[PDB]
Design an enzyme around this catalytic site. Sequence first.
Site, PDB file in Angstrom:
ATOM      1  N   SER A  31      -4.635  -2.871   1.308  1.00 40.00           N
ATOM      2  CA  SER A  31      -5.074  -1.499   1.531  1.00 40.00           C
ATOM      3  C   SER A  31      -5.319  -0.727   0.233  1.00 40.00           C
ATOM      4  CB  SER A  31      -4.040  -0.783   2.409  1.00 40.00           C
ATOM      5  OG  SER A  31      -4.571   0.393   2.987  1.00 40.00           O
ATOM      6  N   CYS A  32      -4.434   0.199  -0.120  1.00 47.15           N
ATOM      7  CA  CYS A  32      -4.626   0.967  -1.350  1.00 47.15           C
ATOM      8  C   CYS A  32      -4.195   0.214  -2.607  1.00 47.15           C
ATOM      9  CB  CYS A  32      -3.877   2.301  -1.272  1.00 47.15           C
ATOM     10  SG  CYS A  32      -4.542   3.440  -0.047  1.00 47.15           S
ATOM     11  N   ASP A  91     -10.311  -4.820  11.626  1.00 46.12           N
ATOM     12  CA  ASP A  91      -9.438  -3.845  10.979  1.00 46.12           C
ATOM     13  C   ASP A  91      -9.813  -2.498  11.604  1.00 46.12           C
ATOM     14  OD1 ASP A  91      -8.330  -1.913   9.164  1.00 46.12           O
ATOM     15  OD2 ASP A  91      -8.361  -3.431   7.575  1.00 46.12           O
ATOM     16  N   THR A 103       0.827  -1.204   0.000  1.00 43.52           N
ATOM     17  CA  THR A 103       0.000   0.000   0.000  1.00 43.52           C
ATOM     18  C   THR A 103       0.867   1.263   0.000  1.00 43.52           C
ATOM     19  OG1 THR A 103      -1.916   1.021   1.083  1.00 43.52           O
ATOM     20  CG2 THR A 103      -0.081   0.318   2.490  1.00 43.52           C
ATOM     21  N   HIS A 132      -5.378  -4.781  10.538  1.00 46.06           N
ATOM     22  CA  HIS A 132      -5.265  -4.300   9.163  1.00 46.06           C
ATOM     23  C   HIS A 132      -4.149  -4.998   8.381  1.00 46.06           C
ATOM     24  CE1 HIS A 132      -5.805  -1.588   5.822  1.00 46.06           C
ATOM     25  NE2 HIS A 132      -4.570  -1.127   5.915  1.00 46.06           N
ATOM     26  N   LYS A 133      -3.061  -5.330   9.067  1.00 42.76           N
ATOM     27  CA  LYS A 133      -1.935  -5.994   8.419  1.00 42.76           C
ATOM     28  C   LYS A 133      -2.017  -7.505   8.613  1.00 42.76           C
ATOM     29  CE  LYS A 133       0.231  -2.280   6.940  1.00 42.76           C
ATOM     30  NZ  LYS A 133       0.128  -1.897   5.493  1.00 42.76           N
TER      31      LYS A 133
HETATM   32  C1  LIG Z   1      -3.509   4.130   6.250  1.00 37.79           C
HETATM   33  C2  LIG Z   1      -3.825   3.461   4.892  1.00 37.79           C
HETATM   34  C3  LIG Z   1      -4.416   4.528   3.948  1.00 37.79           C
HETATM   35  C4  LIG Z   1      -2.562   2.773   4.257  1.00 37.79           C
HETATM   36  C5  LIG Z   1      -1.340   3.706   4.132  1.00 37.79           C
HETATM   37  O1  LIG Z   1      -2.865   2.346   2.932  1.00 37.79           O
HETATM   38  C6  LIG Z   1      -2.156   1.573   5.029  1.00 37.79           C
HETATM   39  N1  LIG Z   1      -1.836   0.637   5.635  1.00 37.79           N
END
Ligand SMILES: CC(C)[C@](C)(O)C#N
Lengths: 256, 256
Positions: free
Chosen positions: A79-80, A206, A10, A234-235
């Site tokens: 993520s992104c 998350d 990300t 999240h990770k």
């Molecule tokens: C915080 C979120 C936008 C990112 C940087 O993609 C992650 N992990």
Amino acid sequence: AFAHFVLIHTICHGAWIWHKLKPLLEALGHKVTALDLAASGVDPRQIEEIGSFDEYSEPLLTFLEALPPGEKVILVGESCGGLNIAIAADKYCEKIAAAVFHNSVLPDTEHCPSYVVDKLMEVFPDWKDTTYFTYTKDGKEITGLKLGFTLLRENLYTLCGPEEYELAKMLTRKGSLFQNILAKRPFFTKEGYGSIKKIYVWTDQDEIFLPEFQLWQIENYKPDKVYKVEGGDHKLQLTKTKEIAEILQEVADTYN
Amino acid sequence: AFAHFVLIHTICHGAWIWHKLKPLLEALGHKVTALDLAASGVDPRQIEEIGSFDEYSEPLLTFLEALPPGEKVILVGESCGGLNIAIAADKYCEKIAAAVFHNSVLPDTEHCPSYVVDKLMEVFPDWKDTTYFTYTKDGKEITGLKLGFTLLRENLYTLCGPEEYELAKMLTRKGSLFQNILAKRPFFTKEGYGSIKKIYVWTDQDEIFLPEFQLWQIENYKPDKVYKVEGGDHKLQLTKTKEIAEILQEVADTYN
Ligand SMILES: CC(C)[C@](C)(O)C#N
Ligand SMILES: CC(C)[C@](C)(O)C#N
């Protein structure tokens, strides 16, 4: 079956985020490529040199271009990273066996490319100690950002150990969402991105891509398959590495 | 007692090598600074822009310069980091409480700066799959190198897990020993570098800085104190993190 997985980090991160998952996938017999996108990880470019999410995706596009005819890969974006997947799919759809979204944004073809990013900002408006700056590239003002250490600790690496969190503080770099650029970018196509198989993986624990957001994405653009990982953060590639590998193995055995 | 430790990585590496030791030292109450030297880690410069070990040491020198009067630090250098320590000590000896060498080269004041590096090349001449290249800077031809993955696996990260080894493959960058530049560099001074307290830490299980070399260094330039860690490998900050922290705590309680 074995597959060639292309792991896509990300923004503000790099290939290093996959340091636990990569060897595990290889231990299952898979080929794994973990790329550093533009101005990410140890890539020599600085973010101010990048003017769009497409330019940011150069290393991924260049890699796919290098794949000999007939060779397909399974893209895995966190993520992104989902945006890099959409961009890549509109240029090399025939080289993509499937795309796996890992607590990732899920662009669609009915709305502008910034659609899910705009929604994300509504659901998670406070980025805590994250800092921002502006730079100009190709006549456009771009908002750059550096993830705050508190944000990293509490929302992104919530359950990661101090040693993984340390890597994030040491390695995360300035980056950008290129939100205003995505807003004016041509829509992702139904023939390219729209045609690829999409597997959505997530956890309701998350702390940044909240349930409201991820469930909203799933309803907005129906994935071909959805995997919900219990626990973690999240990770997931760090906190539920084994579970992620198991899921990826099943994907490799399902799509080719 | 608490101290401010400044961790200095070796060539081709970055602050990331200290990702396990840094939080452990902080858990003991210490202040820790892990720097990325020039063209290392996520530093924006490329090695071809660097013409000497002194230039390579810029981030360390700049950091020491920023220390307010009266504040002293304990430098900890791994492998080639000992050279950065010697360079730093000849400019900021008054800001150094002590220098800890971690399976590191130990320059002296009686011979040329490249002395121990030349000896190292005699003891360990085969760098396996390591690749080399040349570039010119300030009228001198410099030999650059990229550590081979097999060399990393078998000699440097011998006992490190696959996840730590993966980080090395992902993050190690092109670098240089600047051997020919060191050979013509003025000798390190007895008043500066020579005056600082030097603690030599090592393991006889190091597969690159072999016992013959490290014991040769200890005899060549007598350290103020020597700590031998049983087991582990060249990267003790990864394989014997706890032991290294214990030693550093004792150093903090001994020198100020
Ligand atoms: C915080 C979120 C936008 C990112 C940087 O993609 C992650 N992990
Ligand atoms: C291999 C050795 C010279 C190095 C790069 O310093 C390490 N570790």
